Amino acid sequence: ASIAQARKLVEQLKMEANIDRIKVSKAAADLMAYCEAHAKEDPLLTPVPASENPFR
Amino acid sequence: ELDQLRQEAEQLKNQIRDARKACADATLSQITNNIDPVGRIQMRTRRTLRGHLAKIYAMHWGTDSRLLVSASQDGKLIIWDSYTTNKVHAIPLRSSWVMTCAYAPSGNYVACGGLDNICSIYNLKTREGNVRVSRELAGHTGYLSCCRFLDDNQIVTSSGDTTCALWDIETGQQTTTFTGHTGDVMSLSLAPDTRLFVSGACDASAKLWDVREGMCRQTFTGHESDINAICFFPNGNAFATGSDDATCRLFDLRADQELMTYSHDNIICGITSVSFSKSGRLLLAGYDDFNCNVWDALKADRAGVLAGHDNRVSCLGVTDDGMAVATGSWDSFLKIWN
Amino acid sequence: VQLVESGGGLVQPGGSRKLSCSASGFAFSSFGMHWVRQAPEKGLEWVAYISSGSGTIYYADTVKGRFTISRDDPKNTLFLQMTSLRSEDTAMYYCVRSIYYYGSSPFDFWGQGTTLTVSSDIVMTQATSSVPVTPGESVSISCRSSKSLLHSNGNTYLYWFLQRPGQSPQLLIYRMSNLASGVPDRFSGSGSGTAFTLTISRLEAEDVGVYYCMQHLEYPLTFGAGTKLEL
Amino acid sequence: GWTLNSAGYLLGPHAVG
Amino acid sequence: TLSAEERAALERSKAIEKNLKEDGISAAKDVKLLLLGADNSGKSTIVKQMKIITGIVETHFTFKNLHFRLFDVGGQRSERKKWIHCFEDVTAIIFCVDLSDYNRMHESLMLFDSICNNKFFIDTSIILFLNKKDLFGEKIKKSPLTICFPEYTGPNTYEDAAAYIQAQFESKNRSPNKEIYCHMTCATDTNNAQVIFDAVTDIIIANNLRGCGLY
Amino acid sequence: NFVTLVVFGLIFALGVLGNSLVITVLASTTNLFILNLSIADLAYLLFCIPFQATVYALPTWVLGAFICKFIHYFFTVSMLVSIFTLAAMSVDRYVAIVHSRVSRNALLGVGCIWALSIAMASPVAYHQGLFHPRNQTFCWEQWPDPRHKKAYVVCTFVFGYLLPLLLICFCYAKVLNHLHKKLKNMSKKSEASKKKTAQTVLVVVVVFGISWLPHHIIHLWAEFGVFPLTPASFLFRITAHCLAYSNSSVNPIIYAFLSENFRKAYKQV
Numbered sequence A: 001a002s003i004a005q006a007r008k009l010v011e012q013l014k015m016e017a018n019i020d021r022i023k024v025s026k027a028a029a030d031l032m033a034y035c036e037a038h039a040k041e042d043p044l045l046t047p048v049p050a051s052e053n054p055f056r
Numbered sequence B: 001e002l003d004q005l006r007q008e009a010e011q012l013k014n015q016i017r018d019a020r021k022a023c024a025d026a027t028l029s030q031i032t033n034n035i036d037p038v039g040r041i042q043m044r045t046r047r048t049l050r051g052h053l054a055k056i057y058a059m060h061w062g063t064d065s066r067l068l069v070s071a072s073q074d075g076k077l078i079i080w081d082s083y084t085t086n087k088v089h090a091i092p093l094r095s096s097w098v099m100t101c102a103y104a105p106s107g108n109y110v111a112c113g114g115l116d117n118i119c120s121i122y123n124l125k126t127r128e129g130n131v132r133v134s135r136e137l138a139g140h141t142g143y144l145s146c147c148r149f150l151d152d153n154q155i156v157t158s159s160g161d162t163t164c165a166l167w168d169i170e171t172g173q174q175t176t177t178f179t180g181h182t183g184d185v186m187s188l189s190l191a192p193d194t195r196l197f198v199s200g201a202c203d204a205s206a207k208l209w210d211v212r213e214g215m216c217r218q219t220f221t222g223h224e225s226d227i228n229a230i231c232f233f234p235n236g237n238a239f240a241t242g243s244d245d246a247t248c249r250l251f252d253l254r255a256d257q258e259l260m261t262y263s264h265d266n267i268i269c270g271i272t273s274v275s276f277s278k279s280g281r282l283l284l285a286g287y288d289d290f291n292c293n294v295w296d297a298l299k300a301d302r303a304g305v306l307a308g309h310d311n312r313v314s315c316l317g318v319t320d321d322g323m324a325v326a327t328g329s330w331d332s333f334l335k336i337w338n
Numbered sequence C: 001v002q003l004v005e006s007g008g009g010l011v012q013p014g015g016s017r018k019l020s021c022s023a024s025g026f027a028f029s030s031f032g033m034h035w036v037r038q039a040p041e042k043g044l045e046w047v048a049y050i051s052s053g054s055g056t057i058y059y060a061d062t063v064k065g066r067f068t069i070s071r072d073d074p075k076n077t078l079f080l081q082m083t084s085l086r087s088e089d090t091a092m093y094y095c096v097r098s099i100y101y102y103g104s105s106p107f108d109f110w111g112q113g114t115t116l117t118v119s120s121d122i123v124m125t126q127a128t129s130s131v132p133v134t135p136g137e138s139v140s141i142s143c144r145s146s147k148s149l150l151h152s153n154g155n156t157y158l159y160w161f162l163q164r165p166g167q168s169p170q171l172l173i174y175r176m177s178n179l180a181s182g183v184p185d186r187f188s189g190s191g192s193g194t195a196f197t198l199t200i201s202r203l204e205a206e207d208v209g210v211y212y213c214m215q216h217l218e219y220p221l222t223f224g225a226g227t228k229l230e231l
Numbered sequence D: 001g002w003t004l005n006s007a008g009y010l011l012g013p014h015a016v017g
Numbered sequence E: 001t002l003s004a005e006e007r008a009a010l011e012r013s014k015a016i017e018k019n020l021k022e023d024g025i026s027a028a029k030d031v032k033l034l035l036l037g038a039d040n041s042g043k044s045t046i047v048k049q050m051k052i053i054t055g056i057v058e059t060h061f062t063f064k065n066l067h068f069r070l071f072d073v074g075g076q077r078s079e080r081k082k083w084i085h086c087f088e089d090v091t092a093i094i095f096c097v098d099l100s101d102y103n104r105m106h107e108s109l110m111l112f113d114s115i116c117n118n119k120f121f122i123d124t125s126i127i128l129f130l131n132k133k134d135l136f137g138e139k140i141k142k143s144p145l146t147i148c149f150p151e152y153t154g155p156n157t158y159e160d161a162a163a164y165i166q167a168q169f170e171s172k173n174r175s176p177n178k179e180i181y182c183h184m185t186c187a188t189d190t191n192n193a194q195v196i197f198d199a200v201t202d203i204i205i206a207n208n209l210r211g212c213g214l215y
Numbered sequence F: 001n002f003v004t005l006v007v008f009g010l011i012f013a014l015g016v017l018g019n020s021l022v023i024t025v026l027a028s029t030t031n032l033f034i035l036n037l038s039i040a041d042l043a044y045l046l047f048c049i050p051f052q053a054t055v056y057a058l059p060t061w062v063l064g065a066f067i068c069k070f071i072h073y074f075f076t077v078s079m080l081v082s083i084f085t086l087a088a089m090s091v092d093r094y095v096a097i098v099h100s101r102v103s104r105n106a107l108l109g110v111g112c113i114w115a116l117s118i119a120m121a122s123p124v125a126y127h128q129g130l131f132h133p134r135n136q137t138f139c140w141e142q143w144p145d146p147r148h149k150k151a152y153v154v155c156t157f158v159f160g161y162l163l164p165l166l167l168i169c170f171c172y173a174k175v176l177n178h179l180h181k182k183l184k185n186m187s188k189k190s191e192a193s194k195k196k197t198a199q200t201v202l203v204v205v206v207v208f209g210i211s212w213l214p215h216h217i218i219h220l221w222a223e224f225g226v227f228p229l230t231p232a233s234f235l236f237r238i239t240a241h242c243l244a245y246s247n248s249s250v251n252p253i254i255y256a257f258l259s260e261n262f263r264k265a266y267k268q269v
Helices: A003-017 A024-037 B002-023 B028-032 D004-011 E004-029 E105-116 E133-142 E158-170 E193-211 F002-026 F030-057 F064-098 F103-126 F146-182 F188-223 F231-255 F260-268
Strands: B045-050 B056-061 B067-072 B076-081 B086-092 B098-101 B109-114 B119-123 B132-137 B144-149 B154-159 B163-168 B174-179 B185-190 B196-201 B205-210 B216-220 B227-232 B238-243 B248-252 B257-262 B271-276 B282-287 B293-296 B302-305 B313-318 B325-329 B333-337 C002-006 C009-011 C016-024 C032-038 C044-050 C057-059 C067-072 C077-083 C092-098 C114-118 C130-132 C139-144 C158-163 C170-174 C187-192 C195-200 C210-215 C227-230 E034-037 E057-059 E070-072 E092-098 E125-131 E180-184 F128-131 F138-141
Touching: A003 B002, A003 B216, A024 B028, A024 B248, A024 B257, B028 B257, B056 B325, B056 B333, B067 B098, B076 B109, B076 E004, B086 E004, B098 B144, B109 B144, B119 B154, B154 B185, B163 B185, B196 B227, B196 B238, B205 B227, B238 B271, B238 B282, B248 B282, B271 B313, B282 B313, B282 B325, C002 C092, C016 C092, C016 C114, C032 C077, C044 C067, C044 C077, C044 C210, C057 C067, C158 C187, C170 C187, C195 C210, D004 F030, D004 F138, D004 F188, D004 F231, E034 E105, E092 E105, E092 E193, E105 E125, E105 E158, E125 E158, E125 E193, E133 E158, E158 E180, E180 E193, E193 F064, E193 F146, E193 F188, E193 F260, F002 F030, F002 F231, F002 F260, F030 F064, F030 F103, F030 F231, F030 F260, F064 F103, F064 F128, F064 F146, F064 F188, F064 F231, F103 F128, F103 F146, F146 F188, F188 F231
Parallel strands: B056 B098, B056 B313, B144 B185, B185 B227, B227 B271, C009 C114, C130 C227, E034 E070, E034 E092, E092 E125, E125 E180
Antiparallel strands: B045 B333, B056 B067, B067 B076, B076 B086, B098 B109, B109 B119, B119 B132, B144 B154, B154 B163, B163 B174, B185 B196, B196 B205, B205 B216, B227 B238, B238 B248, B248 B257, B271 B282, B282 B293, B293 B302, B313 B325, B325 B333, C002 C016, C016 C077, C032 C044, C032 C092, C044 C057, C067 C077, C092 C114, C139 C195, C158 C170, C158 C210, C187 C195, C210 C227, E057 E070, F128 F138
């Protein structure tokens, strides 16, 4: 009957919960490290000279 | 006896939320408040890719950052030359009701789909000159929303049966199926490594599936209304979703919770499309109110307004190299901004 | 696909003749279509070209007015009318397809050809004409141009063709950098403006023929003398 | 009222004289 | 466009433009329509001259030198809130109501209320088909019109009941520049293509008047 | 005579304000014609009001032959462009409604309307100039033979009034007949639309005819007959001026300020 959906949901949540997590500070570190270490080649962020872009 | 199972699920959610809050030692905005905010970014209409005659529901830049497909409601699927506004191809579709589109990373195949519940794959580099339907994939009982290529042999799609499906093109059958949403999934975004992908549904939720095995990894419940778009941060471990409650949100894979929320009291219209930048420092977003308000991906501050569209924005894409951004709306014109 | 020519034979000088080429197996309505002659014991020579949609038509420097070209799309045919034939028109004709868009690969397929007998310009120069080589060693050939073929867009228009004895040639490399479909990786193109190199690494059989370098910067298109490979 | 300028504007040179 | 191949690519692009505008013109000429309503309501048996062609079902019959397209979106089994804006540019909305189902009548009422009061369909007119004269006309004598609508007070005759249902269905408009055209069908001995034709004619003429500066 | 200048000033201000508002709001197909008509009327008022005010107030012309010819030529050009644009809109509406459903064709029609203006402009310019009596200088006509004057006035009246007026009347009669024939089925929207269309056609035709009749009628009267130099004739002439200017001022009012699309655009901006 309705036991299948409940048991599947419980089992899936059981696998999902039992995982290793990382502090939000480390995640934030990774994000702005990626943002700062790759901003040199971000044409949207830093404007490019009007003689190099193809869409002049 | 189901009451015991419901209580077990409720308590399991209780300690999973407790663990999520325990790992939440601080916030990304508070940590990055020391970084200098990026100033107002002025972008102008460089090229107006015109030639469509109806609403444009999707677009996709090629890997060369020059060729992009644009799928309209007039049954047309046009492959452009963005540099010179040249129409490389103009594919006529079998079913005019299409609202997804794709361009293969190898560049040879092009996907399309919509209310016909069939994902049509077209071959471009045929021995003969014209472009013919390579195959039609019919295994969905709901409208397809987003389709993205994995390689020349595998595709991933989401449809209205609350289900995602990964397909093998050479066979035509669902290689793998992803179920678990209680509402229509409206978009997906493929990771740079093509191993994990997210999918946001109309039940104000997102789920993170894999390719290899087949069931979900993580779930994200941060929104209160429909989700109309989704995209990845370039690192592949964070993703930004656009909802209909006029609030974009940014979640993280590793944190397994919500990171930030981009919102404003002056905006009420829902978000139709989102996309990051080449490095991810900047974030764009398409709003139903004819504009495209750029939001900083690290300060949640409104940067600029690309108010050049005469109708609701629908599709919005940043090239692989990030040289320009293409915005396509129901005004039947794509526009290039740099 | 298939491109079959007809209309051959011997024609008295000063006469008029029709050549008809039939195409089967591809969407002929979307192909710019070229007519190129080859003398009995000389190299290739561009004659005429008609654009898809019959928009632009070009003829060689030596054959304006005397010749005319036309296409019948519904029947998938190409007509070439020759008037006031001379003694230098006793050459074998070849009808060539070419589709023109971004990233396209023109001059890819050639027809069998029909021999008919009769009773400025960019000077493309090949330094060599015959180099004795054996299968197993890399062989390099060179081509030169009288004008800088490298356009401002960054695309330099060079095409490499290989004609086998008694066989129609095929495109090997277009723009000296992209390998055409059905072409082995053995062939490689490189070089800069007015100095082009074609290298065949680990030479094997089936590659014994004559090599042509052709420019596409501006009409009239000019071929080369041709380098003939021997054992 | 009717001045010489306005009258010549309508009637013409010979007519106003 | 200085080089030869760029000029040729521009020529091919111009050829593609000529097709796309040309298709745009033929495509613009046909006139559309969106079929809605509950299941088992005759939403697939309106006109027997179909010329059809699981998902969206197209029908491309012609009438009076006008190409009419019908899209049956039944069987989608999803939320209409995400694809109902695809049909934002339709000429009209055909809504079919089965009168023999006294339990599905309220569901049809809510469906019509949602369709008429949508933000995209504020000016797209509605053609309201009320199917099966005979079945409802016999079951009204078999069963009075009080189990489904206890608020009815008027006479229990056929014509008054039909008019009451029509008033209930048209009361959901509450909007200007959008009209509801009525016709009563049975799919047995009726040819209901003329009602579609003249309803779409009225809608098209009104749109042209509002779009040419008049009105 | 003070009332003359004040009335001209008020009409000029009203017309320039309305036409400027319409041009700014416009910044399809009917919008193209609306913009063209507004441009024509703005040019007409700008090139007419101050100079006729000076003519009716100052005793002598004081701006020279170049100004005299330039201003009168563009006066005639603007008037003809406005009338032809009204005719073009009426035929456009006839085509759109009767043949129920072209930017290139609209542009061809426009460019064409300006070309036609020019033939009639040529006559105003060529034969206009400064006359020196037997002293002082004035700006009026210079025509050797009255036959050419009479023919030109008759031709400009006949063409630039009858052809647009008859075209407008015929096209709007055809669209009214098409509405009354195709939408004979009773419905609230149909009857409201028929009433609104009848109202708009009535307003357009009456305004055009009543406004542009007196100018051409007094010009024909000058050609066939003479003006009696009386104050009443002065009031009649200034009434003709004021009706022509009122048409050039209220064409945007009855052509864009009543259309729902332009009303929405104005409420937006």
